[PDB]
Amino acid sequence: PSIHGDFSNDFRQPCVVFTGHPSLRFGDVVHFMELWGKSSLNTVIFTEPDFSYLEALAPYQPLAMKCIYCPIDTRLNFIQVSKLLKEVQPLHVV
């Protein structure tokens, strides 16, 4: 439920940690960025596309910790929406 509950005692270092908010402006992810930001062997991996990733790392910008922008959006892309629209055939589109 949090860092301090039992994660503060059961945590071993080479690890993968899914937490906080993808905005990087609150949550446990903020503390983790402040923790592992200094090193270069670590890395942050982004998945949520609704936040501009270059804006998310901006307040922690002079950091050596590798950042990966690999969004995993699964919404309808434009070719799928084109096929969908041509199948359904609505009189109008808004």
Add this chain to the structure above:
Amino acid sequence: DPSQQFLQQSLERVYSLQHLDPQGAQELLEFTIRDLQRLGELQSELAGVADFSATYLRCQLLLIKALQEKLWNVAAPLYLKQSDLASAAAKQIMEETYKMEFMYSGVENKQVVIIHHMRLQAKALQLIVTARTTRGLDPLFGMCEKFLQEVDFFQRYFIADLPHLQDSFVDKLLDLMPRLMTSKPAEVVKILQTMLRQSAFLHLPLPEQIHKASATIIEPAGESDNPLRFTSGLVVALDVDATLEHVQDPQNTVKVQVLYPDGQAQMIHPKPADFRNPGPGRHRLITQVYLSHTAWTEACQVEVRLLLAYNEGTIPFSKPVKVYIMPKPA
């Protein structure tokens, strides 16, 4: 109640004998301060007003002690800081006026104008001594104009209270405020110091009901060892509970401060939801607080302490409780 009568008679005793020799005046001051502290210890009802009046009397005692020091007889080049008591006196009275204004409840405008007047006297003493220690003219002009602006801000704030400050220090400053800006700063220092020496001692009208705010940390409790074990860098929780008595707006004024064993003083503003009010006049501050650091050679203790913040600028409020911490490397 003879306790109230004793309090009032002690206060009029020190007020009526303001004409004494500074040695005798100091003796009366500290006698009354000891009496008022003991009175606060005896009866819990009058502990607030005893502490209030005792703090004001301590301010006057420190001012009197500073003004009669052997620092005005010698000239400016022969000034020494090692034997200086007046700078320490000025800082102490400044802090005490803050404490008097904000910690105690039930303060009306007359108490506030008395406290602000004593604060102004403190600022004047600090200006005098800092003029004594320096020779460049830029610092004198700077803090002298800031102090005269402070006097103007005072007398503007308290126009209604001015006809009651009779023979007061501010009454003597108002006789010369339009003309003091004309004179050279050394003469301004001379005149304000001299007329500060013979300034009257202001009566402090007591409120009908008044208490000193108090906080009692109970949940950390500083019991013993078996420190808080947590991994380095990560966070260790610390549940904090305190009983706060006679505070008006704790959720906008009470700040939790922690002191790691270094310069860091991480200050926390708890949310207004954790300030409960189970009974009238007493609160409950049931707050979780978070601490963190890197690995330490062995366990050490962090001093967590309540603070009280006023409109910025803050004061200590409670007894600092230490809690041991054991950051183990991961």
Add this chain to the structure above:
Amino acid sequence: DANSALMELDKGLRSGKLGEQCEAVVRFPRLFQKYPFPILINSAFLKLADVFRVGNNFLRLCVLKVTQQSEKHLEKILNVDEFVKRIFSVIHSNDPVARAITLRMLGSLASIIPERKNAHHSIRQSLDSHDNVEVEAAVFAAANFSAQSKDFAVGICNKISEMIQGLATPVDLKLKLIPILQHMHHDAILASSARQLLQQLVTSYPSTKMVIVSLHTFTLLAASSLVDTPKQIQLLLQYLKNDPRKAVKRLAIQDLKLLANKTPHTWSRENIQALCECALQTPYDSLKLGMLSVLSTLSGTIAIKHYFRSSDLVKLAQECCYHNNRGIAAHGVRVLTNITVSCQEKDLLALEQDAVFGLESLLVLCSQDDSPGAQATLKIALNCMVKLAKGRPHLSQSVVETLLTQLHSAQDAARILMCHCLAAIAMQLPVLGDGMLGDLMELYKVIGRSATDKQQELLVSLATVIFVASQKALSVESKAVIKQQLESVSNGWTVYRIARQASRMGNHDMAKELYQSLLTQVASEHFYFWLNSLKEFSHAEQCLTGLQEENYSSALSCIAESLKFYHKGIASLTAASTPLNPLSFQCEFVKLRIDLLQAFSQLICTCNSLKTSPPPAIALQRCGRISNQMKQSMEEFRSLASRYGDLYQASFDADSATLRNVELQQQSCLLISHAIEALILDPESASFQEYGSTGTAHADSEYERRMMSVYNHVLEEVESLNRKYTPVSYMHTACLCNAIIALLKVPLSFQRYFFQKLQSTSIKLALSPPIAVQNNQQLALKVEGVVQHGSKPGLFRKIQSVCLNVSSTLQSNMTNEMEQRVEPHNDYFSTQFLLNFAILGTHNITVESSVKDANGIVWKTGPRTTIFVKSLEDPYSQQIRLQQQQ
């Protein structure tokens, strides 16, 4: 060890023969002092409570003695409930002695376990018991618990009232039962109820013992509960005047003296008038003495100011000042002295001469009989003489004149005391030197054949007052003094103390004469070096006696001659140092005098170089060499002032006079540096007005008086020459050289801390101990220390802070600036520091310990402690750093 000793004591406990058990039990508190470890204390007290429960009454008595002696270690008891539970079980024993020892045990434990209600019930039930020992033990325990618990006090006050008012309670038990009531100071209504009970006691039980006990405990209760103090005072005065018994009156006097000692400000004019009426009315001189002691105690405080021309107090003090009895006269004239030195009304002018002639009469009365009571009265009168000559300085000529006319006829002890008084008076005003000096000198002749015991101390005191009187050089007089010493003293300790006083008053030629005589008869080499160094310093200071105003060549010659002997002396004094008593203050004080005289020599040389090295063809500037050397002299004198300042700060144990003397040295250095600046370097921007309130310059010595006079003269001379001349004129040189010569003319005055160390203190400063540490795992340090003390801790200065400052450096910069101020709270402070060594080199740790006294003054006194810490990273972190560095 701890455990070994505890095991041995338990073995003694199980021994089953009473002797070894008692031995072990009474051996327990010494073990507590040896090893104050709370686990040991808790386990040991558990064993003690267990042997208390099962064991005959004598063993329980030994355990009670232990608990009474080990009251402080009771605070370190954790298993309080179990301990008390097994102590408390023996209250059910039918044996009343066992119950009595148990009640006394609970009374001894009232501090740690008040509000234990079953214990309260045991006190209450045992109070009305039949066995006398059980009732007394219950009374004692009730006293302790009433002192501790408010609930117990309010619960037991009614029982005590009904017990006194009960009729089956005998008189002696009532007497023991009354002073429980002095512990009813927890509450206002509680105190008021107790006061009502005590009034009922004095009215209904008017026997001398019971009124004494009741009105004395009522006094203590009103003393603690401050609301009842005025009615207590008026009750005591009423009993003093009305009750005819001398014992009751004596108690009224003694406890009014107690009240006047603790709350004099609460005394009213009516109370003082009533007491004065009592004193005038009484025919018994013992009572008159007692309430006059009370009056003198009041008059010492502000109560006289509250009391106020002519009045019953003044009539009393005039009447009693000439009393036949010496004690009444002494107290009455002390009252007169206090009133005279307090107020400045126009009727008091007639009162002062009355006081003076009263002091005269006391000198005629008390200076012959040599009784110890005569010594007490003489000390009172002489302290009064000193007081009203210091407080009313226009009245000191007559004081000294009667002291002179009486010094001829007084006995030896009276001569010692009057010489001390005269020395104080002479130190406080300098305008009476040569005349009274001649009279004390013609007195000095007849001291060789006075007695055998007080002769030495009389010689010391008389030579001291001779030196205070003198302010110049004496040759035939010094010959007479030296001849007297060789003829009659032949001791050296008297000669050494006389030479000490000669150094203190600045009479250095005859001090050199005495110190030189003492080299032969000393036994240890350290003292030989010390006495030789004192001889050289005294000779060096006397070299400056030959200075002359407006003769700078003679000034250079005299300063060089002084510096030669000063250098010989400082070498000898550094030879006098030892691991024990290292002459730190003396070394540093003499070294700063060395540097000051060398700076003066350099300044005079430069002032002469103004004309001995004219400027070049350069078209401040145009006087380049003289300006640069003026600047160097300015820097030197400022550094000298700073070194006098840190010497002051390192002098935490010194008396006030020594600190003022060092402060005067610093001020002379600052005066010379400021004169240099305002005359040569920065005259334009030094527009400072010397508007200091010089009237209140209360000089504490003739030496300090000359120091302030020469400061004032140099400063006003500088002020008169602020912008008059170009900054390299010969008048600037004349001003600076005259300042130097006038500063040197007043001779140096060594002080007490140079010769005599009191109130020593130091810090052991233990801390966690070529030390490696992982860079990531930043250092956690524990620093702790005890404050040592020589005799009484708080003689001059009180210590409540330790401002431990700690820093760090690399390649043994200033990376770990941090400090903590800790109150020791048991003369032992302990705190922790966290230190970062992210740099992978070696860091040296320097930790200091300054002290903030009660007034807020910081004294760099504590030891400078240094350790070396090796910082490094683990090989895995180092290896990943190397991989990641490229």
